[PDB]
Amino acid sequence: ATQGVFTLPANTRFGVTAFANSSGTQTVNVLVNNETAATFSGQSTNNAVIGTQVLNSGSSGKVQVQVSVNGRPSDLVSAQVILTNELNFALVGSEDGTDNDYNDAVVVINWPLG
Amino acid sequence: ATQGVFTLPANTRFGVTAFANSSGTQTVNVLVNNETAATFSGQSTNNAVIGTQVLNSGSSGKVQVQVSVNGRPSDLVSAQVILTNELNFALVGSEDGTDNDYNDAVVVINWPLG
Amino acid sequence: ATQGVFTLPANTRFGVTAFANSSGTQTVNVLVNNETAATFSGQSTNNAVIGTQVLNSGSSGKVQVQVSVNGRPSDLVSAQVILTNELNFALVGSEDGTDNDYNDAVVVINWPLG
Amino acid sequence: ATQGVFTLPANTRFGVTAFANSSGTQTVNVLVNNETAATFSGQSTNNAVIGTQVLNSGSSGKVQVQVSVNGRPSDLVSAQVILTNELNFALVGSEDGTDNDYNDAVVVINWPLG
Ligand SMILES: C[C@@H]1O[C@@H](O)[C@@H](O)[C@H](O)[C@@H]1O
Ligand SMILES: C[C@@H]1O[C@@H](O)[C@@H](O)[C@H](O)[C@@H]1O
Ligand SMILES: C[C@@H]1O[C@@H](O)[C@@H](O)[C@H](O)[C@@H]1O
Ligand SMILES: C[C@@H]1O[C@@H](O)[C@@H](O)[C@H](O)[C@@H]1O
Ligand SMILES: [Ca+2]
Ligand SMILES: [Ca+2]
Ligand SMILES: [Ca+2]
Ligand SMILES: [Ca+2]
Ligand SMILES: [Ca+2]
Ligand SMILES: [Ca+2]
Ligand SMILES: [Ca+2]
Ligand SMILES: [Ca+2]
């Protein structure tokens, strides 16, 4: 199944934050309506916050997360959780290697803000 | 129901990151085995990271998140999610007022690291 | 925080399934637009499916779960999870006593159907 | 990523319930310790329960769900959710065709029981 693609409310701010846990340098791309809106990168095995930003979901609300390590795409897992019918989290893990810890880059998207 | 309390595997590193979305100054306490292990405090209406730290779950694995604003405990909502039987997220939202957006302090706990 | 209340897309079929795990007889009421649309009752300590039914979310999409044991409301806990940006689960646990296993009546709502 | 595989606590009784939403007949196998422990089959486009059973997770706790339709394995999506640090759901959706509704067989695993 497709992973790392979420439908957000239209025209709404959301936070996106990325964490690294790998010997490889991660590159995280955040796409909004199929255009690159943010790119984060770093190298840490201790959960460094390699980027955080507030973005707007635009007219379609379509948000996609892509992760790659020196050009090769990582395998993604994802889900969305809603607490008390209001608070949303979209969660992404990714695997760049063979140990299947799926933490090599971790992306958290949260809304609403403010 | 009790919220904000999580059982982690013993002696496991985990990341904790807190965001703020409120006019009020948020104080986030992270307790490991009933003892304060980290405290974050900050104010933002734009999802600013008010703290991030790597902690160890200790011998009991009990982790608890408290949130208060000017000494008043916020109402909490929480859940844990596990992706591909390996990647864990413990998620907390909190409400300090009346609009019930439950984002006034948001806390994300993730493990494993490394 | 409020629990057991979910907003579904309007005029959408959904499944609702209740399980029991308690010495007390559980009564599960499912409200659609503030009106009782289904009710199930039974006693089991071995996860009996005390009822399963297909309902329609109506014009408002507002779905609420209520659980009581001998007229006393149980304490509820809930969340919603979305898989591959399509498949929705709304999950309810409830506690009728003091052991806080929150399985005394368990309710699963899933959509889409068909 | 691997989907439909879950590590339960050893020697624990859990419930498993399967629903169908497809023109195809679903066969759902539940494996404990890499052997088939239960098999459900049926056909419905209305979310019928095609089986429900209580099983033991055994010495290793490893549980796996597989779904076959028309002779071929369906693509799976899954996650695990824990509410109030005590109530566990392992959730599986599956796709036997081309419309990607991932509801063609839906499997819910819940524990603890009792
Ligand atoms: C240090 C190692 O770096 C890569 O091999 C990752 O895939 C591993 O999960 C681990 O983080
Ligand atoms: C600016 C406002 O500040 C407090 O009143 C919060 O409870 C609101 O959710 C909002 O963030
Ligand atoms: C058999 C017991 O019945 C009630 O006391 C429940 O609250 C308990 O959780 C347990 O199921
Ligand atoms: C009736 C249809 O039957 C199969 O084609 C399923 O894959 C579809 O999702 C739909 O349920
Ligand atoms: Ca890895
Ligand atoms: Ca790693
Ligand atoms: Ca608020
Ligand atoms: Ca707020
Ligand atoms: Ca109980
Ligand atoms: Ca019980
Ligand atoms: Ca299908
Ligand atoms: Ca279907």
Residue numbers in the entry:
A (entry chain C), B (entry chain D), C (entry chain B), D (entry chain A): 1 to 114
Describing publication, verbatim:
The opportunistic pathogen Pseudomonas aeruginosa, a major cause of nosocomial infections, uses carbohydrate-binding proteins (lectins) as part of its binding to host cells. P. aeruginosa produces two soluble lectins LecA (PA-IL) and LecB (PA-IIL) specific for galactose and fucose, respectively, that are involved in the bacterial pathogenicity, adhesion and biofilm formation. The fucose-binding lectin, LecB, displays a unique carbohydrate-binding site that incorporates two closely located calcium ions bridging between the ligand and protein, providing specificity and unusually high affinity. The two calcium ions contribute to the receptor specificity since they coordinate monosaccharides with the stereochemistry of two equatorial and one axial hydroxyl group present in fucose and mannose. These two calcium ions are also believed to play a role in the unusually strong affinity of LecB for fucose, which is in the low micromolar range, as compared to the millimolar affinity usually observed for lectin/monosaccharide interactions.
The neutron structure of D-LecB complexed with Fuc-d12 was obtained at 1.90 Å resolution, and was jointly refined against both neutron and X-ray data (1.85 Å) collected from the same crystal at RT. In all four chains, the fucose ring adopts the stable 1C4 chair conformation, with the α-configuration at the anomeric position. The deuterium atoms attached to the four hydroxyl groups can be clearly visualized pointing away from the metal ions, establishing hydrogen bonds with the amino acid residues in the binding site. The Fuc-OD2 hydroxyl group donates its deuterium atom to OD1 of Asp96, Fuc-OD3 establishes a hydrogen bond with the side chain OD2 oxygen of Asp99, and Fuc-OD4 donates a deuterium atom to the OXT oxygen of the carboxyl group of Gly114 of the neighboring monomer. No hydrogen atoms could be detected on the acidic groups of the binding site, indicating that these are all negatively charged. In contrast, the hydrogen bond between Fuc-O3D and Asp99 shows an unusual character with a deuterium atom located almost equidistantly between the carboxylic side chain of Asp99 and the O3 atom of the fucose molecule at 1.30 ± 0.21 Å away from O3 of fucose and 1.25 ± 0.17 Å OD2 of Asp99 with a very open O..D..O angle of 162.2 ± 1.8°. The very short distance between the donor and acceptor (2.47 ± 0.04 Å) and, importantly, the delocalization of the hydrogen atom equally shared by two heteroatoms defines a low-barrier hydrogen bond. Furthermore, the coordination of calcium and hydrogen bonds creates a network of contacts between two aspartate residues, each coordinating one calcium ion and accepting a hydrogen bond from a fucose hydroxyl group, forming two 6-membered rings.
